[model samples]
Structure formats: C-alpha cells, structure tokens
Target chain A: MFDPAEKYKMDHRRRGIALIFNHERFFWHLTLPERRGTCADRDNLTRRFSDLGFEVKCFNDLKAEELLLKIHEVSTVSHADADCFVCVFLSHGEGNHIYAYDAKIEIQTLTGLFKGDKCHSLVGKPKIFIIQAARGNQTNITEVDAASVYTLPAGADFLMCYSVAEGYYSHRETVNGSWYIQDLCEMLGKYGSSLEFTELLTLVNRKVSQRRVDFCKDPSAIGKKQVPCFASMLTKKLHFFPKSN
Target chain B: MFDPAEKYKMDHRRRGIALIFNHERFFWHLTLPERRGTCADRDNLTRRFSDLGFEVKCFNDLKAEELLLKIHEVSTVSHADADCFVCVFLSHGEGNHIYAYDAKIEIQTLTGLFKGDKCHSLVGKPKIFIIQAARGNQTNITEVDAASVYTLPAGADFLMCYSVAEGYYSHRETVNGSWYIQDLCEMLGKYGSSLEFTELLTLVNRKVSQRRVDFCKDPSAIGKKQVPCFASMLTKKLHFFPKSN
Candidate 1:
C-alpha cells in the first residue's frame, strides 16, 4: 500500500496512441450556467490530445445510459484500433461516482469495458482516465496564504487527475474560468512537446500554485493548491507524445 | 529541486489547515455538449465544499481577468478566515503555466500572493496546493503501479493530494467517475470525523487501488492506481479536525 521512492525509476518504453473522450454535457437536464465554460475546456483538451496523435473521441451531453453505451462502444472501437486506451470524464460526481445527467455511474463500469481478457487488444498497453470533479462538499479553512506543493505516484499506465483535494472546494471565476483546466492547457500548449510528463507536471504544479494567488486577494484564499495522484502500472517509462529525439 | 523525505518530519508544534487547488479546465473553450457535464461537475463540487462546513463562494462562467480577480479576492479573504488556505484547480495545463480561458497565467502569480510580508495572517501557517492535470502531451508510455502504502509520515500537519503522477494523463469515466475523488470521498466520509487528514487521504489511496480493479479487465488497466502527495510547510503537527479520543 505504500510507494517507495525507488519505485519511480523510469524505463524508456514505447506504447501506442491514446484515446481521449471528454463528456461536457449530459442529455437529461438543462445545462447549468457553470457548465458553459467546460465546452471550451473540452475543445481545447481534445485539440491538445489530437495534436499528440491520439484518436480522440469526444462526447458531449450524454445521459448515464448513453454515456455507458458510448463507453462500451468506444472501448470496443479503441481496442480494435489501438493497443491502449485513454478516457476523460468531465462531469458531475459525488465522490468516487459520476452522474450521467440524473443517473450515477461508478468509474469501474466504464473502465471495466476494456479489460484485457475481454478486450485483448489493450492487454499490456496503458489506459488513462483524467477526471475533473469534486469528491465531497468542503471549503477552505485556512487563514494562511502560503502554498505548499508535493508529488506522488499514480497507477501503472493509468493516471487520474482531481480538481481539488478531499474535503475542499475548487474555485472558478465568472470572468476568468476554471483554474485547473486553464493551467493544464497552458502547460501542455507550451511544454507538451519539449518536456517529460513528470517534469512537465511539476512545472504545472508550480504554475497553478502561483496563479491561484494572483487571482485572489484574501490571505486565506491566496495559497490554494492541488496535488496530482499517480499510480503507475507500466514496466517502463511511458510518454503520451514523445519528442522527435 | 528534489524534496528529501527526511524533511517531512512532523513536529507537534505546528497547527493549521492546508489548502490545495487543481484547476484543470482553465483557458479551454468548452463546446455546448461538454458544458453540460462541466457545469454539473463544478456545481456538485461547490456543494460538496458547502457540506464540509465552508463559507463557499462560487463564480460560474468567468473570463481570464475575472478568474484572476476572484483568486485575489479569495487570497485576501483567507488572510482573515482561518489558519491555513487550500485551493483546487481543474484545468488544462502543461509544465510552467495554467490557462485562464484562453489566457495564460503563471503559477507564481497566484502563489506569490501570500509572501510572509504581504499576508501576515498566514505567515507561519501551512498553505497547500493540489493540481490535477497533465504536465505534458506525450501520448503513450508505461509506468509502474506499485507503492508502499505504509511509509507515509503519520503525524505530519501539512499534506497535498494529486490525482495522477507527474507527466501522466489523468483518467476519468462518465460511468465510473473520478478514481481519486471516489476513494477520497469514501475515506473522508468514513474516517474524516475520526482520523487525521493524512490518515484519511492515505486510506483514500488504498481504497482507490482496491476498488478501481473492478473497472478494467486488462491487468494494466485493472492495476491502475493513485497516490496522494504530501508537503509540510508547518513546523509542528496541527490538527484542524482531530478524531475523538
């Protein structure tokens, strides 16, 4: 249950293309005002992935059942088309579960579709899922304005991104937009092709921490932070889009 | 630039809350379909914070400048509210910067808001930031999914949680939801009232690894995992929400 530092040794290994899917809208309900910004976020993310040679399958406004169907269809298709799969879910969630409009879905249901035994196409390849949602209803309780940063391991071949820490709130600006997505796009757009994933994410962490302070003035709110969770399952170092070297 | 493990010692003298932020949806333009899910995601997140007993303030549909304004506002507010601050960002990013609705924002802009001199309220408190976004655009790479779940510093007062490892893509499913958040919520809901923050998040990591296997058939996919990041800025062990003795 613990990741020793020695576990992070990188082995250069080449893998297949990634398949990214963004679910911005659900089919069952009227779009909420906050969601309007995600439309742009999804587009930018898709473009970034596409630039990296991924066969991106972007879905919008899907209900729980529809989302499930799409996942199954996409998993089947991606497995047939490539050696690995990558999926992104940008939706409403309650802890470890996400909602497809009014219905709730566990992350296991979508990922279960691509099991290697059932879908042998992606046996050893990496499968990534980037999730943007809150785990619970909690708000900032600190009065200090300093920012602290750290790093950790994610599952092999599978990495999951969260917008906020457990028992805390994620911030958005009516004028600017979502903070995490904004920082992510900026880093990827600038360094996606030049830096390694871990190095790049470290920089992303640094950038997000600094940006949060400039956006707000409350000392308590000045230093907001987000830590990425990593669980590597690969035998070698994997890159989504390696440089031309 | 490396963080030595010995630096993580917990001194019982420190006391305060840490704030982390991962804004992954910044600067990206969301399409109509994607907007639906993003809105729900953000709303649900805001609600989760409220439930955690925070005085929540939400700004939906903002531009880059507005996002900056809000961040500043929060920073100023945190200067007076509690002992420490936490922020989470769910945005698209790379290495050194985050986006603000098409506008790039430096990480320093936000973290700099709380210099010891500028924000005296949090001069000595722990400020934590957690980011959940991709650091690079590398499409295919494999990594190890192994970790030592028991090595975490049990008494540290400051901690951060990330959804994925550095450089890796974070995965999400409409059906399964966010792996990190799911594990986090389960842990917090089950232990937050009784356990320390680090213990709670550690359990989250364990639960995520255990529960995520049901989602995939591929050993790699099924073996995907997540680990929480920790950073201690405090000089002592400060428990904001301690378990009942």
Candidate 2:
C-alpha cells in the first residue's frame, strides 16, 4: 500500500526547482533570543538550497499584506524562470490564517498565486508550502491523536506542510531547535537526494513523535503533538533533485 | 555522499519500536479539563499496536512514584514477552524531565528502567521512547534552520522521538486532534505493513510539514520544517509489523 515508487518515476526528469521563503521577526513583538537563531537558520537553509542548484529567493521580515505582494512578485518571476515553487512561512497562526507582521492573511489567498491560469509559469508544476505555526493553545502531552481532516488544496500541485496539527502547540527545544524544521532539514539534507519525498517525510514523523517526551514533567502544561498533510495535483513523481543515470 | 540503499539498510536494521505514553491527569493536578477524547486516542493507539501483533500495555493517570514503578513493571513484562521495548510518555514536562502527578521525573530515569542490568529482559533489545511535553512557557514561532544531531548508543538499540524538537511549542487541533500523533497514525496506518519503519516515518514528516499551513497563521510562527534523528544499536532489520512472502 505504501508505494514510494509511484512518487519516484520522475527521478530522471530535470524539472525540479524549489523556492524557499523565510519570515523571521514579528513587527509587533520584540525579537526573542531564539528568534535570532531562527533567522540565521533560515539564511543557512537558503544557502543550502542555492548550493543544491535551486534559484532560491529569500525574504526576511514583511507585513502580512506585503507577504501577499511578495508571493505575487515571486510567482511572476518564477513563471518566467523556473519549474517548481516553494514558499516557507515562519510566523504565528490560528486557524486558516497566518500573521502578516501586524495583520493576518488567509493562507489560500497568498497561495492562490499559482493556481491554474493564475500563474501560467506554474500551471502544473508542484508548489510546496511549508508552514511553521500553532493551531491552538490546548496542548495535550500524553496521547497523540490522529487528525480527521486529511486533505485540502491551496493551489494546483500544492503541498501544505505544518509544524503541528490543529489545536496543538508547536514546540522548540532550547538545546536542539524547532521540532518540525529540524526534522525536515535533517531528512532533506541526508536523504533528499536518495529517498522519495514522502519516504523521507515518514522519517520526520517518527523523529517528531519519539523526541517530544524529554520535557513532559512540567506542573503547568501538557506536551504537544503534530500531524502533517499533503495534497498533490501532479500526475507524475517529483523530486527536489533527480539522480542522473 | 547520499546513498538510499545503504541508508535504508542501516535504518531498516536499527529501527526498533515506538511506544507513546500519555497521562493527561496525574493525581496531584487532577482539576484540569477532562479531555476524554485524549484518553480514547491513547487506547486506540495501544490497540492498533496490539492488533499488529506486538505486546502492548496501557496505563492511565498514576502518581509520580506509581508511574516509575509501572515503568519497571512494563520493562519486566516486555523483557519476558517481546524482543524490544517501546515506551510512550504523554504528560507535562520541563526541559529533560517528565511529571507523573506532583513529582517530576527526569526522562533519563524513565528510560533507565531498561538499561543494562536494570532489566535483563530488554537489556539488548531496542528501547524506544516517545515524549510529548512542553519545556517552558516561551512559545514563540520562528523560521527553522537546518541542523542535524544524532544520538545513538553502541551495542544497544535505543531511539528517542519527541513531538517538538526541544524548546518549541507543540500544538493540537481541537477539531482534528494531536498533530504529531495524527500524522504518525496516518503514516503507520497507511504504510506500516509495506514500508520500513524509517521509510514510514519520512512520509509522516512530509505529511506534517505540508498540512500545518491550512490550520493557522502567525508572522513569527509559520512553516512546518522538521528533522528526526536516529540512534542505532540493532544487528537486524526491525519492523513494527514485518511482512512475510
């Protein structure tokens, strides 16, 4: 039932490009010591992707509305230049929306830039959106449950990734770093060139699930859990970088 | 530098078992809202593993001392009953310690139950620990940088999975459920039988990283980028439910 081969046929194709966007500081909130590290971390990610042959476009602090504009800007550029598109949003969130500096933007409105006929350049290519935010304040540490809402489309060939599931907290370690991003980069850096995207993602799940127990003894709060989802419009398999025969 | 076959072979042999423990209400702090749904979710996970042919155990809210005693009990039972041991901790936490009611228990103390000479039954088997808790109150969202850490034990199969990496907040969806757990079940339920343990975990990472955006929005808290680590000490391929031809 788990056939990664289905997502690996396009390993010989060369139409793989990733756009990584990172938003670090919140305009209304003062930057925390941890936030500084996150900004530096994103910068490193940009370089890593660039090193991997992706024409990466990195964005720092922008208002929520400005984020929409930037998406339009990047989509227009990618339509004229690249194959795949990647957007990474690092901010705070509730349900269905992300903070835009001092404002909020619906995730769909921002991602709608590459929908069919919207951005001719990405008509059918995969658009991956990586979101690192919390859905709610209620944190339950002991029992990690399964999410009910399985799939939804933000755009054609779009894949939405989250830091945590709905109604759970997204955690960061003082010692290790952010849970979701750390797992992602580790899997991508080590296995990106070899394993299928979904296969690599499975490892992330295990890592996140197994590591959260280090801090479960607090008197005031419960621990957090996460669940990730995917929606694909591409008919063929896609890789960040396909291996050459 | 990146070889899937070798990595897969290594991961296959080292992957052991994952056990999730969640006790929402300990004896000391019993007045919190009774989210019976969480308890049900834990039971379901235990049953899922049991149905897959592993010897599973379920524990409800226990005092700190009782919780410690139960760890010993379970380790003894697992040693006498199975090849490896998996422990899941769902509770409150601070840094590297977990709470069992009013008392705080360091994570090392819990996992120490299965150490060499402590429990002869599981001395050589893989001891996997999955923790879900919050370390502190500083819940700020930020961009994720790519950094990898590997924690492995020589001659001993041990793996630790955390819901959030280290200091980040872990969120759950009131409507959907726990993020990490939901993603975990989705991957395990869909791919557990066919794929290797790590392969299945990679898919979970993909799903969690992709789906978190649709649920929330915060300028400083966006994107789901996760990296999971593996510490191996096994001599043979480990599968939660190994298939036969």
Candidate 3:
C-alpha cells in the first residue's frame, strides 16, 4: 500500500552521505564537567545513520575549530554525485549555540557551511541535516505555519531539525540520550524506509514535544519537558529506502 | 535621587566580573556569509557591560572545545570574592546550544557550569546573566508563562534572558543588533542602576515583547514577532546600583 508519490523524492537510485558530529566531552576547564556520558548518544547515532544506507563519518569530541574545519571540508566534497547529504551534532545547548569544549559555535555555521552556493554544486540533490542535543529541553506546541517555497528560512537551501526552539530547552538522558534523538532513532528504525523524511520528522516533532521525563529521572540529576522543531527551504520530499537490494 | 533601599540585594559594596563570549565568524568554512556586520553587537555589549562597573573578559571567536576549558576555569574561580557573575554569548543558535567556532556547544553547559552541586561553591553569591542571540530569528508572541521558581528552570542559581521563546525564533538587526540585547542594553543603561534586577527585567519583558519589526511589513526578508523570555532560580531579590561612593 505504498504511495508511489511518497517514494518519488527518494533517490534509491544512488547512495548518500551522513556526517555525524558527535561530542561527549566539554574538555574545557570548567565546562559542564565533561560529556563523559554522551557516549551512548554518539554510538547510537552512528549505528542508526549507518542503518539508513548512507556512508557515515563520525567526528568525535570535536572542539569548535576542529568541527568547523571538518564541516567546511565536507561541504566542498561535491554532493553533486550523491543523492543527499545529512549531518548530526550532539551537545549541551541553550537556544542559539551549542556548547563546545570550552566556548561555543553557531549551529547556523555548521549547517550553513555544508555544500552551498559558495560552491554552487547541487541544489536539488543536497538535503543537509543538523540534529543537536542528541540534548537541551522545554515544551510549547504553539503556532502552525506550513513551510512554503516562498520563504526559505535559514535562508537555507538546507534543512535543520533542532531538539528545541530558539528560546526553549531540550532534554537528554544519561542512560540513553536526548528525547528527540532517541525518539527520532526509534521511529526511523521502525518506519524510516517506509516513510518520507518530512513525514518522519513530523512524527518526531509530535512525539518529542509530547514526551516527558523527570530530568532523566533524577530528582537530583535533572528534569524537564521538551519539543523538537525544524526549519526548511526544502523543495521536495526525501525518503530512505530500507533497501531490498 | 538615590536611596539605600533602592539598590536592593546588589553587592555594589563589592566588585564583580562579566564574561562576554562574542563570536562574529563561525571560523568554520561556510558560517555566516559575512559577520561583516556583527561588530555592533560585540562592541556595544562590551561598552554596556563595562559601564556597569564590572570587570569584563571578552572571548572573541572561540571554538567549541576551547570554550569548555575557559568556562571550566571560571567555574572554579572563587565567586566568594565577587558580588555576582554575569556572562554573555553572541552567536547563531537553535535551542539550548550556542554556536561555537566550528562546532556547537550547549548553552546549558555555559550557564550551568559556572557553579553547581558538582563542586558547588558559588551558591552563596552568583548572579549569572546569559543573553543569547546576543545573536538567531523568527517570531511568535503567542503563549506566555513566566519563569517559575517551582521548576527552577535552567538549573541555574541565576537568570537567563533569551531573545525568543521555546520553539520560537529570535529577532536581530544588521545595523543595531539583537533586539533583546540592544533593548536590554538600552534599558539597563538608562534604568539599571535605579531599578531592581527583577524590576528591570519586568520592563524588558514588556518592552521587548511589545516591539515589532519589518517582518510585519515584508512578504519575504522580514516577518515574525518575538518576546523576550527569562529563567530564574534565584532565592532572593537582586539589583543593579548606578553607584554610591
């Protein structure tokens, strides 16, 4: 009962690449101790993105400078040959920036730097992904404005999926990972190939915003609510074929 | 013009320090097409914080990893000597994370690392200030829920001022800077010395939320409404003193 239209945007015809910017330590002098526990977040993301039929490059514990260099380098690799491009980030966050080893960098930079008008390679083929906080939380499911071709938000020829909104918080578990990332991974595993990318994200958004936690279940550890959000200048649908080949 | 009680809880009797993490360029490859214009955001923030009679330490173009080490060093600095601690981040962001040089760091880590039960020492005297979007955008003034001490959001023994709300975008100006930061700086300079920290923020909330922009005017480049939001886990009143020799 698959709609041919749903699979239309997917390029099972060729392979793609997914780059994971995984961080587990702040390494900075007095930063949030260290990201010692983020191992699960990193490991799981690697496994899942890989499961999706893409070549995954995992950059671990990257400082802001290192991460940027890597992303810039990747941005130039020429996505014209691939079906799409996806990227991921895991870290502590506020609303505008993600915490690095000691300082912070712009997510806008990470996502924006990926193959773009700077190189003028593939506009139709590039579908960049940025997932953060595999962590950060808060809840507010208000306002509904459909993504329109008229306005391409980050001014993106790109797509960004955040754990939370600009002024909100995102939640992550020490034992597992971020509610959004975990939930996204879960849903993706179960129905990714069967569904369109936008559809999966919509479900992720609904599920993430509705999920609850007792600050990772530690009255002492922490507690909060969360809601995932995204921005798109996307022109079409994207799907992941579980691959029958 | 000045009354002892007017200075409420402010330890103007003692000196304090302010840390500004101002990032104009992502330093990564394709970050901001041009920070070419963010200078006003950095320059003005420096001038404003200094005028408050606090020593200011500005970290410009810091990477994610380095940011961690620096903040850790500060987290250990004895807040016992200062009346309060104020920190600022100027960068692009999504939610709980701020953008670093190449990668993204958690804003939660920056705001949360200063002092905590982990090595908890500053509980007695730490008035942290995190102003974000200090650079990001979009708009929604739909829902309103003031910060509650019951939840102690941000897990901070302090206050955070965001340019937007949970799942919402913040507003910034190329010529002026972020509305929240610019407006906050303006009000703080004019009335901070005379108002209680809480009172000043109350005014800021009203002023910022009420402010509108060209998005209200354009079909494309401009569109969105925003309200400043804050999180406080303070047990008592805090104020800013203009000065009383």
Q: DockQ winner among the candidates?
A: 1
Interface RMSD of 2: 14.1
Instruction: Name the top TM-score candidate.
Output: 2
* lDDT against the true structure, each candidate: 0.46, 0.52, 0.57
Q: Using Cα atoms with residue i matched to residue i, what is each candidate's TM-score against the true structure?
A: 0.44, 0.46, 0.45
Q: Candidate 1 on B1-245: residue-level lDDT in tens?
A: 42211122223232223332333333334321121123333444454444444444555545668778877876675454454555555444444454445555665566666645456666655555544433322122222222222111111122334555432234444333345555555555555445434444445544443444445534565544453444322333333453222
- DockQ of candidate 1 is 0.04
Docking class of 2: incorrect
lDDT for predicted candidate 1 compared with the true structure: 0.46
Residues A30-109, candidate 3, lDDT per residue (tens digit)? 34544444566667777877888788888777777887788788778766556677877676654446666656776656
lDDT of 3 by residue, B104-212 (tens): 7766566667645543546645456655552322132221112111101343335555555432345555667666677777777777666545446545555664565
- Fnat of the models, one by one? 0.05, 0.00, 0.00
Candidate 3: stretches off by over 4 Å:
A1-245, B1-9, B30-37, B118-121, B134-152, B214-218, B221-223, B243-245
DockQ winner between candidates 1 and 3: 1
Q: Report the number of the highest-lDDT candidate.
A: 3
The DockQ-based order of candidates, best leading, equals 1, 2, 3
Task: Identify the CAPRI category of the predicted complex in candidate 3.
Answer: incorrect
